[PDB]
């Protein structure tokens, strides 16, 4: 339309209509210019042998991408509290994505002081892979999410991807995907961008805890873990963190089994034992990148699934013991709980076969999840010489561009019909006075979530 | 339309449809100010070479020009595989070229700094020669192609042209074109420029290698070439680099025969010999300009035609030997092979007569090949002095202008009909590991092409 | 690609994986230490699917 008239409006709201929900969210994003506009190869060889299982090869493109894949980008902690207490199951239906008010900047430094200045004409490229032709990196639970708190201006992560390798060296069946190779809309300070998508039919997430224990059809499959007691003295005095792993191996390379098949964290009454790789472990606000104390982190626990699913630190049964059991006919089992901080969809790989695709971290396994949305600044070159040069231009203006993002996802709900006479279990805050209200900013403006929140509260008969 | 509203969008795709293909490609570009806004004159003397062979005369103009003439611009090394393996030949039909998102930056130079700021009102001139009035430079296989790898940002080459000469002096017939006398379009920061073209009907390019040798009619014409061996002990220890080469002569100036009519590189089974001037020798990536040694240059070979065309290091026969042979009736031959890095078209000169006009370096010879596109910045004059002076203004504002460029060509194909029982040769990557992926960016960030690619793989009965 | 490496090499996960059970060589050294699964270490990242 034009430079002066806005390209959109700010919608953050949630509107509860009957059995369905519309949850919209809008944040600000700054996208710097990564890799000086240069695709490059990445691999760690720090040693001629390097690391057995930590060696990798791939590329690192300049494009940034949008991760909204987490629940707390769409839900205000109330709307979550409203969601878990009153409902048995839910599931996404449609997603609407609007990207507006692009603002481009030009960082020029003169006489020791660098001064930002609007570059009106410069453009920003964006596209959505709707054929899932690029590597799908949103499934790995990476940071870089939309921020949980609307007032937080956030920065956009970089997109790079990995491919086949032997040692740190690639092999011909690797492939190099140029992202420039797709058609992508360009945007100036006046344009916006919008698209919609329909979620493929997925079974509801079942948010409830069976109220009727299975043995009162045989319990589901189990893959044992080691057991760690949060109280340190209970644990053996040895470096068993990696040696005592539960690790599936592929192509000679080991992978710790994290989280593994859904299993109750611990037996009835013992809450201080968690399985080693068994649980998602979320860090509190301000938790350090490395070697942070046990209490800097929140530990998810699946007590609710214990009735049907076998405990993660005890063996399955006796025929000698049986540590790892497959699928027998007549099993039943429950999924892994989805949490406020935890992911939503994770893309199913494309194979000739799979079994019960619901992904081990939780969420909705989808052969066709919401596309990636890739973005970069149109590179604007610095003054090229008057003398013609064969080589490509290696010097560009510094630049970055900012603006708004909105997303609106329609969730369909399943009401509670229960005939239970006595009261349910609801999730409520505590009245007990405290220095700072949970789930709100402290005196420096730091929005900090004190606890994970699971979705299994209401109960059913088995 | 306006400042803030993007004029045109990034299109880069390949669309494989039935028998015909569409390859669109885009690039980013910066245009300096050439020759300080002055038509100039150039001889060998201004360059400094005193030979008669290298004598020339002509002008060198501000206007820039686009060159997509090279295959690697439109086709991505995937396609040029899928393009060659599966097909008995091709040719272009329609080329569409656009140019949008002009931006104009006015470099400012201080005592120690030069800050770039937009000059919104400034303009850019562009036009295309559709009547083929100007000289046509695209037929010399010059540098300055659109880069092969889309994220590159390529500098536009200058436009200059040679005219008739005696020594460094002209003759009255030597003529001088002033491009400003051609009607052109003027583009401020909001306007775009686009046209379409139609390739005049030419023979399909022949992509195939005859399975059956001619002697199992007569072979085609031959002009011998001194045989040079990549085993440098075998080669005679003498300075035969210039004296040895065959050279077609004109107007008293000997011009090397480059490459010359299509002939086989070497006798079957001897791969280390090559025509001294017969075959194109592409520079590898990273290769310097001058006095390079052997491994820094890829060397094509014509082996696929060794059935029909006679060896370029051999005599055509005996009658006493025959070193050169013109066309007899009842001859047959096949033209030179187009390569991924090679040219696409050249312009059949305007004459009263010619024979088999399809060019030597490969590609599709045309009497109305795609027009050139010339471009320049309309100069903004610096402040005049308050009192008139008849002179032309010699002081201008230092600018360059950048933007996008995109081109869409439609190739047509000819299917493979063969009833051959046993499998073919197909071009492919080599699975074996390597420190880098061929045809992809390394750790440094510079895109390299390891090897040329011919178009002749499938076989036909002769 | 391959099923273990589906991860993105540039960006740390928000999941933490226990990395140390002891402080150092000695007696009564039991301790817990958690860390981010990140491109630095890719063997331990929590992944969706298993062969």
């Amino acid at each position: 339309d034009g430079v002066g008239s806005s390209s959109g409006n700010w919608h953050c709201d949630s509107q509860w209509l009957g059995d369905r929900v519309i949850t919209t969210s809008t944040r600000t994003w700054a996208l710097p210019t990564y890799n000086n506009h240069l695709y490059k190869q990445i691999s760690n060889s720090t040693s001629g042998g390097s690391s057995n299982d930590n060696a990798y090869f791939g590329y690192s493109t300049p494009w940034g991408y949008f991760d909204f894949n987490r629940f707390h980008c769409h839900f205000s902690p109330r709307d979550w509290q409203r969601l878990i207490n009153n409902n048995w199951g839910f599931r996404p239906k449609r997603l609407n994505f609007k990207l507006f008010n692009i603002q481009v900047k030009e960082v020029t430094d003169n006489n020791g002081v660098k001064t930002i200045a609007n570059n009106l004409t410069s453009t920003v490229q964006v596209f959505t892979d709707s054929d899932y032709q690029l590597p799908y990196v949103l499934g790995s639970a990476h940071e870089g999410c939309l921020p949980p708190f609307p007032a937080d201006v956030f920065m956009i992560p970089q997109y790079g991807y990995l491919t086949l390798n032997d040692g740190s060296q690639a092999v011909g069946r690797s492939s190099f995907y140029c992202l420039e190779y797709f058609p992508s809309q360009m945007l100036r300070t006046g344009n916006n961008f919008q698209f919609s998508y329909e979620f493929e039919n997925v079974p509801f997430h079942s948010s409830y805890a069976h109220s009727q224990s299975l043995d009162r059809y045989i319990p589901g499959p189990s893959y044992r873990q080691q057991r760690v007691s949060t109280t340190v003295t209970q644990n053996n005095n040895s470096e068993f963190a990696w040696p005592g792993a539960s690790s599936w191996a592929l192509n000679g390379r080991n992978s710790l089994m994290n989280p593994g098949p859904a299993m109750a964290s611990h037996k009835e009454g013992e809450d201080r034992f968690f399985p080693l790789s068994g649980s998602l472990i979320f860090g509190k606000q301000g938790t350090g990148r490395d070697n942070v104390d046990a209490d800097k982190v929140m530990i998810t626990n699946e007590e609710e699934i214990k009735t049907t699913n076998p405990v993660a630190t005890e063996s399955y049964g006796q025929v000698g013991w049986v540590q790892n059991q497959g699928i027998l006919p007549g099993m039943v089992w429950q999924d892994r709980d989805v949490y406020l901080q935890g992911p939503i969809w994770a893309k199913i790989p494309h194979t000739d076969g799979n079994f019960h695709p619901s992904p081990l971290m939780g969420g909705f396994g989808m052969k066709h999840p919401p596309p990636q949305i890739l973005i970069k600044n149109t590179p604007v070159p610095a003054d090229p010489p008057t003398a013609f040069n064969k080589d490509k231009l290696n010097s560009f203006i510094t630049q970055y561009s900012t603006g708004q993002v909105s997303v609106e996802i329609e969730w369909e709900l399943q009401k509670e019909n229960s005939k239970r006479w006595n009261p349910e279990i609801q999730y409520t805050s505590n009245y007990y006075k405290s220095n700072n209200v949970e789930f709100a900013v402290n005196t420096e403006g730091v929005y900090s979530e004190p606890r994970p929140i699971g979705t299994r509260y209401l109960t059913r008969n088995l | 339309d306006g400042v803030g509203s993007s004029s045109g969008n990034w299109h880069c795709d390949s669309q494989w449809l039935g028998d015909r293909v569409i390859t669109t490609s885009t690039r980013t570009w910066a245009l300096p100010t050439y020759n300080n806004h002055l038509y100039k004159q150039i001889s060998n003397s201004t360059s400094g070479g005193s030979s008669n062979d290298n004598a020339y005369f002509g002008y060198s103009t501000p206007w820039g020009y686009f060159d997509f003439n090279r295959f690697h611009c439109h086709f991505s090394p995937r396609d040029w595989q899928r393009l060659i393996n599966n097909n008995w030949g091709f040719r272009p039909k329609r080329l569409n070229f656009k140019l949008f998102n002009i931006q104009v930056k006015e470099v400012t130079d201080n005592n120690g700094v030069k800050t770039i700021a937009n000059n919104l009102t400034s303009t850019v001139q562009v036009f295309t020669d559709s009547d083929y009035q100007l000289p046509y430079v695209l037929g010399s296989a010059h540098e300055g192609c659109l880069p092969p790898f889309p994220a590159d940002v390529f500098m536009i080459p200058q436009y200059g042209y040679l005219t008739l000469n005696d020594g460094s002096q002209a003759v009255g017939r030597s003529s001088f074109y002033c491009l400003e006398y051609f009607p052109s379009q003027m583009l401020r920061t909001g306007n775009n420029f686009q046209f379409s073209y139609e390739f005049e009907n030419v023979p399909f390019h022949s992509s195939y290698a005859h399975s059956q040798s001619l002697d199992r009619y007569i072979p085609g014409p031959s002009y011998r070439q001194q045989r040079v061996s990549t085993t440098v002990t075998q080669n005679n220890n003498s300075e035969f680099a210039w004296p040895g080469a065959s050279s077609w002569a004109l107007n008293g100036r000997n011009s090397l025969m480059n490459p010359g009519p299509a002939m086989a590189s070497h006798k079957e089974g001897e791969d280390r010999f090559f025509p001294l001037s017969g075959s194109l020798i592409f520079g590898k990536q990273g290769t310097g300009r001058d006095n390079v040694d052997a491994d820094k240059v890829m060397i094509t070979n014509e082996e696929e035609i060794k059935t029909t065309n006679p060896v370029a290091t051999e005599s055509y026969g005996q009658v006493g030997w025959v070193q050169n042979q013109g066309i007899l009736p009842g001859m047959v031959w096949q033209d030179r092979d187009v390569y991924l890095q090679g040219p696409i078209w050249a312009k059949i000169p305007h004459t009263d007569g010619n024979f088999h006009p399809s060019p030597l370096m490969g590609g599709f010879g045309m009497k109305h090949p795609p027009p050139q596109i010339l471009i320049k910045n309309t100069p903004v004059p610096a402040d005049p002095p308050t009192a008139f002076n008849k002179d032309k203004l010699n002081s201008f504002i230092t600018q360059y202008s950048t933007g996008q460029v995109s081109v869409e060509i439609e190739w047509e194909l000819q299917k493979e009909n063969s009833k051959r029982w046993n499998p073919e040769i197909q071009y492919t990557s080599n699975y074996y590991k390597s420190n880098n992926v061929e045809f992809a960016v390394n750790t440094e960030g510079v895109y390299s092409e390891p090897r040329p690619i011919g178009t002749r793989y499938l076989t036909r009965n002769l | 690609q391959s099923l273990d490496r589906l991860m993105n090499p540039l960006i740390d996960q928000y999941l933490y994986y226990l990395s140390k059970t002891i402080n150092g060589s000695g007696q009564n050294q039991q301790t817990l230490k958690f860390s981010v699964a990140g491109p630095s270490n890719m063997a331990v990242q929590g992944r969706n699917y298993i062969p």
Partner: antibody
């Protein structure tokens, strides 16, 4: 091999400004930033800030935000810091180092440093 | 800016654990690196990241980083090894923050 070369020393009396030069020889020179670390006698290393090679825009340090000015040139392939107001306090050996990522997006460190530079400032 | 011990003892054939400490924003979110500096010569990058050593560096040098505090411990020492050390780190704007001079004494 990747190398960074400061110029020779100068001796400049307080109030004088002295620029320093760093020649990046053997690499692209636009993909990596260049950090200026200073050491004044009996003091720790001190970071005068970085320039973004291709960018031309610099990020200075809290202490040096006023006085220090950074400029570069791609053609001569060198980068310049200019300390406009020399003082007795500002007597140090100046270094230019580059960020080097060791072929990984994730890691950042100053792998290559120049041989050195020393500024003797005294009236 | 980081706070580390300024003077650190040594004796031939003994390891030396060199401590560095910082706030969560400055060092928690950022990997510390250690630079070895000899007066009159350019600094060397011993350890880049928490536990990694560059190809040039010897096997004995190592690194142990934990939340705020990030240490360094070197093995089989010599007086030929003895020089000044530094604790380098990166903030949110990626300003580089050097902890302070720690120089050994070998005797």
């Amino acid at each position: 091999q990747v190398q960074l070369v400061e110029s020779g020393a100068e001796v400049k009396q307080p109030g004088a400004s002295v620029k320093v030069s760093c020649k990046a020889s053997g690499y692209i020179f636009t993909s990596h930033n260049i950090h200026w670390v200073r050491k004044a006698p009996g003091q720790g290393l001190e970071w005068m800030g970085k320039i973004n090679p291709s960018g031309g825009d610099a990020n200075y340090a809290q202490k040096f935000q006023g006085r220090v000015v950074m400029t570069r040139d791609t053609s001569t392939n060198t980068v310049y810091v200019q300390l406009r107001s020399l003082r007795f306090e500002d007597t140090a050996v100046y270094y230019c180092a580059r960020v080097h990522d060791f072929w990984s997006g994730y890691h950042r460190a100053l792998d290559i440093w120049g041989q050195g530079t020393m500024v003797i400032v005294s009236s | 800016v980081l706070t580390q011990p300024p003077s650190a003892s040594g004796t031939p054939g003994q390891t030396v654990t060199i401590s560095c400490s910082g706030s969560s924003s400055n060092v928690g979110s950022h990997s510390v690196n250690w630079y070895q500096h000899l007066p009159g010569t350019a600094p060397k990058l011993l350890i880049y990241s928490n536990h990694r050593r560059p190809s040039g560096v010897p096997d004995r040098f190592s690194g142990s980083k934990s939340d705020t505090s990030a240490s360094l411990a070197i093995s089989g020492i010599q007086s030929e090894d003895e020089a000044d050390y530094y604790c380098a780190t990166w903030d949110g704007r990626l300003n580089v923050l050097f902890g302070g001079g720690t120089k050994l004494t070998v005797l």
